Design a protein around this ligand. Structure first.
Ligand SMILES: [Zn+2]
Ligand SMILES: [Zn+2]
Lengths: 116, 267, 244, 111
């Protein structure tokens, strides 16, 4: 029940649970996205599992074999990795929000999984 | 009517096909545009002129004008009673807004929203008597237009039957009927006539004269033509003046041998 | 004639929309349908590669060319060293390749939505089998691969996706203009009758009533003069609504 | 056919004349129909000509009654224009033409 207006999205409110309303302008198509990955060490053939991805594609910082010195030479394994359905959307301010003499603001929205 | 001709051509090309096509840079596609259009315009000379047909009072092209089922024309009536009623309605709007007070409608607008949203799931069929009535009403429309061919403001073609079937189906959906009945066709024809409807002695007498001479071409003087008209003093004088205008202004009738009682033939 | 017989597979039971493919269907076999919009030209692509060793003349390979790689050796075993390499013109093998783009059919799109599209890859004797505008139906494997530029575009580690075609039916292929002996016998038996001219003239467009001049003009124009233009050209002008 | 026959020539000539005469103004069209009436008018039947006479008279009566749902015409005019069994035909009845012998009159209903 805690609605907030689009212009009230300050940098204070990063990370909290929020409700908002808007009008949808664009709906981009669907892509698979990498979530947790498995990498094979090219030197020794050991699989390192569950490398959690950030916004960027990342390799492990260290081989899982304790008697191995590799930190660079890795190859991704596809049939062990996990993929996530992804969608990107743009929204606009509804007309009832607008202040005096003002043009509507727009936001980028990220959607995952079954809501695609 | 204030759009650019480029944008009007774009709308007409979309309305013809109910599709939009794209071929630019590195994308080609075709799309669907199943939307009903409602439009408003002002007459060209500022006020509607009843002495001319609809083609001159509106700056649209005839292909664009062919796309509309219904045209409605709205004029200032210059009548005291209607002016009083309009003034009372405006002041009732102001009075209701001034005290935050609703009117007493029969139904809620939300109930009407539910009804209109529910009724569009129906797909009524055409009954036998409805088909017979559609044929009869199309005949009536084309007959009356042919009787007023030189004076009707808008022609009648096959497309009016398509519009009539659409209006009948919409009325059946309004009453939630599973079939089109006779009454839907009848009221659709009445509404279509009321939307459509928009010297004459000279035309009638000259028509009688020209029809007799044209029919006499299936068999093949001015006083003899006048005598046939009279058998078929004010009427005789009017017939002489009509023949005089048909010769000397319209040139419909030609004096084959000239004189005070000339021989006459149709141009 | 040949080296290998391919097996194409048809009438796979489950159909998907382009709009409805998810991460479940990766490396599965699927069937879709749509309209062709863009098609590339036919180009040769590497299939099996061998290399020369500059250091000792030994021939390295064969290496089966993978989908998205520049395959190369690093060590020649016959000299046990990292000798320089050259492409062997005499033993490299190629096959035909084509790429098309397919869009959802406009008939099947719901209210107010935009159709989606996919890229399809054709190899070998599947090439040159369709044109832009064709309604087609594709059966193939749905796969994915990484692209760093696509990652930088979207801002998240997204993956490129494709369909590798295995069977195609073109729904817009016209019928074969070939006649059986039964058809030729029927044509002869029709041509023997004396009323055949009036049969043809009146049987063109039987729903339209009258206008025998237009019917005879169309009938004599469907046949052609012998040729020096041989074609017979016809123009009609008429009021709107007169079924022209 | 392997060769052009006299019938093929007659068909081509008839198509050419029929297409040419219709393109002119109405008076020139009347004159040329009168001139080439041998080649143009050969294929019609008496029943089709009687339908033409009847429908032309009904059109003239519709114009006349408009200027002065059904049409009635005296039979004597139809007989005189035919001179210048058809009532039993399918063509006559399917065009809603009817006959009354008690008044000797052609009848039609337009609905
Ligand atoms: Zn390692
Ligand atoms: Zn070597």
């Amino acid at each position: 029940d805690a609605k907030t207006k689009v212009r009230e999205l300050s940098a204070d409110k990063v990370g909290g649970l929020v409700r908002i309303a808007g009008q949808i302008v664009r709906t981009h198509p669907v892509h698979p996205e990498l979530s947790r990955a498995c990498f094979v060490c090219e030197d020794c053939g050991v699989t390192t599992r569950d490398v959690q991805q950030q916004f960027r594609y990342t390799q492990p910082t260290k081989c899982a074999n304790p008697q191995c010195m590799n930190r660079t030479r890795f190859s991704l394994d596809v049939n062990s990795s996990t993929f996530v359905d992804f969608q990107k959307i743009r929204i606009q301010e509804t007309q009832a929000e607008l202040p005096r003499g003002s043009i509507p603001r727009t936001v980028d929205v990220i959607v995952r999984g079954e809501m695609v | 009517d204030k759009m650019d001709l480029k944008d009007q051509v774009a709308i007409h090309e979309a309305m013809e096909q109910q599709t939009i096509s794209i071929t630019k840079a590195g994308v080609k596609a075709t799309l669907n545009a199943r939307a009903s259009i409602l439009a408003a315009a002002n007459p060209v000379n500022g006020r509607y002129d009843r002495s001319r047909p609809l083609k001159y009072n509106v700056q649209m092209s005839a292909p664009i004008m062919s796309r509309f089922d219904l045209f409605f024309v709205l004029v200032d009536e210059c009548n005291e009673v209607t002016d009083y009623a309009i003034a009372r309605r405006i002041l009732d709007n102001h009075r209701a807004i001034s005290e935050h007070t609703e009117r007493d409608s029969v139904y809620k607008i939300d109930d009407i929203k539910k009804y209109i949203a529910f009724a569009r799931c129906f797909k009524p069929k055409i009954s036998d008597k409805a088909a017979e009535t559609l044929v009869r009403e199309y005949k009536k429309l084309r007959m009356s237009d042919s009787n007023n061919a030189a004076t009707s403001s808008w022609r009648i073609t096959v497309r009016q039957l398509e519009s009539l079937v659409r209006l009948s189906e919409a009325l059946a959906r309004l009453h939630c009927g599973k079939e089109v009945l006779v009454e839907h066709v009848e009221k659709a024809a009445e509404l279509l006539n009321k939307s459509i409807v928009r010297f004459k002695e000279y035309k009638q007498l000259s028509d009688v004269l020209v029809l007799h001479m044209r029919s006499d071409e299936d068999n093949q003087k001015q006083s003899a033509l006048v005598e046939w008209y009279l058998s078929t003093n004010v009427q005789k004088t009017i017939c002489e003046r009509v023949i005089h205008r048909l010769i000397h202004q319209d040139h419909v009738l030609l004096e084959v041998e000239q004189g005070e009682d000339p021989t006459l033939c149709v141009h | 004639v040949c080296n290998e017989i391919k097996v194409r597979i048809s009438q796979l039971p489950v159909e998907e929309d382009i709009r409805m493919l998810r991460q479940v269907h990766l490396n599965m076999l699927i069937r879709t349908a749509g309209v062709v919009t863009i098609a590339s030209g036919i180009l040769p692509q590497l299939a099996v590669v061998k290399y020369d060793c500059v250091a000792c003349g030994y021939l390295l390979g064969p290496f089966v060319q993978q989908n998205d790689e520049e395959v190369r050796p690093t060590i020649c075993p016959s000299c046990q060293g990292k000798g320089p390499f050259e492409l062997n013109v005499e033993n490299t093998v190629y096959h035909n390749y084509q790429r098309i783009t397919m869009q959802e059919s406009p008939n099947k799109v719901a209210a107010g939505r935009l159709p989606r599209s996919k890229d399809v890859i054709l190899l070998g004797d599947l090439c040159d089998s369709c044109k832009p505008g064709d309604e087609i139906e594709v059966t193939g494997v749905y796969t994915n691969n990484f692209d760093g530029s696509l990652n930088y575009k979207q801002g998240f580690p997204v993956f490129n996706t494709l369909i590798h075609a295995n069977h195609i039916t073109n729904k817009d292929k016209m019928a074969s203009d070939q006649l059986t002996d039964e058809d030729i016998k029927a044509i002869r038996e029709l041509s023997q009758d004396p009323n055949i001219s009036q049969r043809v003239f009146s049987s063109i467009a039987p729903s339209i009533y009258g206008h025998d001049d237009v019917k005879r003009a169309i009938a004599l124009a469907l046949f052609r003069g012998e040729a020096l233009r041989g074609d017979i050209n016809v123009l009609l002008c008429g009021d709107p609504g007169t079924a022209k | 056919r392997s060769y052009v026959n006299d019938e093929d020539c007659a068909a081509a000539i008839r198509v050419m004349l029929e297409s040419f005469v219709n393109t002119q103004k109405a008076s020139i069209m009347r004159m040329m129909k009168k001139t080439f009436s041998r080649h143009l008018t050969e294929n019609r039947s008496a029943n089709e000509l009687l339908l033409f006479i009847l429908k032309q008279l009904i059109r003239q009566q519709m114009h006349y009654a408009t200027a002065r749902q059904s049409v009635t015409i005296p039979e004597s005019e139809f007989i005189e224009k035919a001179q210048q069994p058809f009532y039993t035909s399918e063509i006559f009845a399917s065009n809603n033409f009817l006959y009354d012998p008690s008044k000797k009159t052609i009848v039609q209903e337009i609905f």
